[PDB]
Design an enzyme around this catalytic site. Structure first.
Site, PDB file in Angstrom:
ATOM      1  N   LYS A   1       5.437   4.021  -0.769  1.00  0.00           N
ATOM      2  CA  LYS A   1       4.891   2.692  -1.143  1.00  0.00           C
ATOM      3  C   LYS A   1       5.607   1.674  -0.286  1.00  0.00           C
ATOM      4  O   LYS A   1       6.804   1.675  -0.208  1.00  0.00           O
ATOM      5  CB  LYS A   1       5.200   2.342  -2.591  1.00  0.00           C
ATOM      6  CG  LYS A   1       4.646   3.439  -3.487  1.00  0.00           C
ATOM      7  CD  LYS A   1       4.429   3.088  -5.030  1.00  0.00           C
ATOM      8  CE  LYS A   1       5.551   2.385  -5.622  1.00  0.00           C
ATOM      9  NZ  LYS A   1       5.440   2.251  -7.118  1.00  0.00           N
TER      10      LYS A   1
ATOM     11  N   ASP B   1       0.301  -1.509 -19.115  1.00  0.00           N
ATOM     12  CA  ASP B   1      -0.684  -0.675 -19.711  1.00  0.00           C
ATOM     13  C   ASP B   1      -0.979   0.545 -18.850  1.00  0.00           C
ATOM     14  O   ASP B   1      -1.264   0.424 -17.653  1.00  0.00           O
ATOM     15  CB  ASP B   1      -2.009  -1.445 -19.886  1.00  0.00           C
ATOM     16  CG  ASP B   1      -1.961  -2.519 -20.998  1.00  0.00           C
ATOM     17  OD1 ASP B   1      -0.999  -2.604 -21.765  1.00  0.00           O
ATOM     18  OD2 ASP B   1      -2.930  -3.290 -21.043  1.00  0.00           O
TER      19      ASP B   1
ATOM     20  N   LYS C   1       0.814  -1.198   0.000  1.00  0.00           N
ATOM     21  CA  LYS C   1       0.000   0.000   0.000  1.00  0.00           C
ATOM     22  C   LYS C   1       0.857   1.260   0.000  1.00  0.00           C
ATOM     23  O   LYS C   1       2.067   1.191   0.097  1.00  0.00           O
ATOM     24  CB  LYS C   1      -0.964  -0.024   1.184  1.00  0.00           C
ATOM     25  CG  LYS C   1      -0.250  -0.016   2.494  1.00  0.00           C
ATOM     26  CD  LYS C   1      -1.256  -0.374   3.573  1.00  0.00           C
ATOM     27  CE  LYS C   1      -0.491  -0.839   4.777  1.00  0.00           C
ATOM     28  NZ  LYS C   1      -1.347  -1.796   5.526  1.00  0.00           N
ATOM     29  N   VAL C   2       0.239   2.388  -0.290  1.00  0.00           N
ATOM     30  CA  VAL C   2       1.019   3.599  -0.381  1.00  0.00           C
ATOM     31  C   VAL C   2       0.462   4.463   0.760  1.00  0.00           C
ATOM     32  O   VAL C   2      -0.768   4.553   0.958  1.00  0.00           O
ATOM     33  CB  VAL C   2       1.014   4.236  -1.799  1.00  0.00           C
ATOM     34  CG1 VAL C   2      -0.413   4.489  -2.240  1.00  0.00           C
ATOM     35  CG2 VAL C   2       1.951   5.588  -1.823  1.00  0.00           C
TER      36      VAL C   2
HETATM   37  C1  TAK Z   1       0.798   5.963  -5.859  1.00  0.00           C
HETATM   38  C2  TAK Z   1       0.356   7.223  -5.419  1.00  0.00           C
HETATM   39  C3  TAK Z   1       1.303   8.239  -5.234  1.00  0.00           C
HETATM   40  C4  TAK Z   1       1.006   9.579  -4.829  1.00  0.00           C
HETATM   41  C5  TAK Z   1       1.882  10.609  -4.809  1.00  0.00           C
HETATM   42  N1  TAK Z   1       1.213  11.712  -4.402  1.00  0.00           N
HETATM   43  N2  TAK Z   1      -0.009  11.457  -4.202  1.00  0.00           N
HETATM   44  C6  TAK Z   1      -1.083  12.260  -3.862  1.00  0.00           C
HETATM   45  C7  TAK Z   1      -2.369  11.705  -3.701  1.00  0.00           C
HETATM   46  C8  TAK Z   1      -3.503  12.461  -3.357  1.00  0.00           C
HETATM   47  C9  TAK Z   1      -4.781  11.879  -3.485  1.00  0.00           C
HETATM   48  C10 TAK Z   1      -5.913  12.621  -3.179  1.00  0.00           C
HETATM   49  C11 TAK Z   1      -5.810  13.960  -2.811  1.00  0.00           C
HETATM   50  O1  TAK Z   1      -6.982  14.644  -2.536  1.00  0.00           O
HETATM   51  C12 TAK Z   1      -6.924  16.136  -2.641  1.00  0.00           C
HETATM   52  C13 TAK Z   1      -8.357  16.750  -2.426  1.00  0.00           C
HETATM   53  N3  TAK Z   1      -9.148  16.991  -3.671  1.00  0.00           N
HETATM   54  C14 TAK Z   1     -10.610  16.877  -3.371  1.00  0.00           C
HETATM   55  C15 TAK Z   1     -11.374  15.976  -4.365  1.00  0.00           C
HETATM   56  C16 TAK Z   1     -11.120  16.417  -5.831  1.00  0.00           C
HETATM   57  C17 TAK Z   1      -9.606  16.568  -6.081  1.00  0.00           C
HETATM   58  C18 TAK Z   1      -8.812  16.144  -4.840  1.00  0.00           C
HETATM   59  C19 TAK Z   1      -4.546  14.572  -2.706  1.00  0.00           C
HETATM   60  C20 TAK Z   1      -3.403  13.811  -3.012  1.00  0.00           C
HETATM   61  C21 TAK Z   1      -2.508  10.382  -3.991  1.00  0.00           C
HETATM   62  N4  TAK Z   1      -1.474   9.631  -4.336  1.00  0.00           N
HETATM   63  C22 TAK Z   1      -0.234  10.127  -4.471  1.00  0.00           C
HETATM   64  C23 TAK Z   1       2.618   7.892  -5.542  1.00  0.00           C
HETATM   65  C24 TAK Z   1       3.003   6.627  -6.005  1.00  0.00           C
HETATM   66  N5  TAK Z   1       2.070   5.703  -6.129  1.00  0.00           N
END
Ligand code: TAK
Length: 267
Positions: A39, A133, A23-24
């Site tokens: 991760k 993909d 999981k991350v």
């Molecule tokens: C998987 C994921 C990641 C990763 C790196 N940065 N990061 C950021 C997020 C993230 C996910 C969701 C987030 O929500 C912000 C709030 N808003 C509100 C909803 C509409 C747009 C988003 C903000 C950041 C998710 N995953 C990652 C890195 C490597 N592998």
């Protein structure tokens, strides 16, 4: 913190996504508070499916990635039970959630973001040890409103976000032999279409209509969409992989080439 949640110079926090091999989590540098995405790959699960060599090749490859529109890998710490891949965290969240919350992007903005996404895709086509993909959900947005793609190979940890699953290129769902790079083009046509129209070009909770729709290749072109970008969407969403645009074709399309940084496609 409450427990054993520190590794290296980082403190691990909430789960952002789960994948096949772990999981991350959101993390923060312990001295600076700076956020990272860690991760955590469960090495016993890796041994279980017997993909130890493929995971190590992928981690080694990803260590050397450097592209302004791919999430960076800062450090890898391995322990007997996990690999911790400390990655760049980006604040904007996932492109599809953004569009879902704010609706469509203005055309010029759609083109800016689209040119960054396709450059990152092309770099992955050139550098991933093994082609896998593209996953549209892996396209994220940074604090500056620029695209950043999270790696989507075996260590992909991208898990969920919102509402409006069954969705893939025509030749994939028809159970035909196919080539990754051509299906990736189709997936980029779905991304472009969502930036421009604020919706997916094939929507349908009924999984047979959806699929017939996909293989049928019938999609709505709103009135506000110009015709120069409509022709791109159509050539990228061609049901027939042999007729579908390649990255070179996209590069020469008039709508795309407009105001395109050269460093995005070297050669
Ligand atoms: C998987 C994921 C990641 C990763 C790196 N940065 N990061 C950021 C997020 C993230 C996910 C969701 C987030 O929500 C912000 C709030 N808003 C509100 C909803 C509409 C747009 C988003 C903000 C950041 C998710 N995953 C990652 C890195 C490597 N592998």
């Amino acid at each position: 913190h409450d427990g054993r949640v520190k590794i290296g110079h980082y403190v691990l926090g909430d789960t952002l996504g789960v994948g096949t091999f772990g999981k991350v989590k959101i993390g923060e540098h312990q001295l600076t508070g700076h956020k990272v995405a860690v991760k955590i790959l469960n090495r016993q699960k890796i041994r279980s499916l017997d993909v130890v060599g493929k995971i190590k090749r992928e981690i080694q490859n990803l260590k050397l990635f450097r592209h302004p529109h791919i999430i960076k890998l800062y450090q890898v710490i391995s322990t007997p039970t996990d690999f911790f891949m400390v990655m760049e965290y980006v604040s904007g969240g996932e492109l599809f959630d953004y569009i879902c919350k704010h609706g469509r992007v203005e055309e010029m903005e759609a083109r800016r973001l689209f040119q960054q996404i396709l450059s990152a895709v092309d770099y992955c086509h050139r550098h991933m040890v093994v082609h896998r993909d593209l996953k549209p959900e892996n396209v994220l947005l940074d604090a500056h409103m620029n695209a950043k793609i999270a790696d989507f190979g075996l260590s992909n940890m991208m898990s969920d976000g919102e509402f409006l699953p069954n969705y893939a290129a025509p030749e994939v769902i028809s159970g035909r032999l196919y080539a990754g790079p051509e299906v990736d083009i189709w997936s980029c046509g779905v991304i472009l279409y969502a930036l421009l129209c604020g919706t997916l070009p094939f929507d349908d909770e009924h999984v047979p209509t959806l699929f017939k729709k996909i293989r049928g290749g019938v999609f709505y072109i709103p009135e506000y969409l110009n015709r120069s970008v409509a022709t791109l969407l159509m050539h990228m969403l061609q049901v027939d992989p042999l007729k579908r645009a390649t990255i070179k074709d996209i590069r020469e399309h008039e709508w795309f080439k407009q105001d395109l940084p050269s460093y995005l496609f070297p050669e």
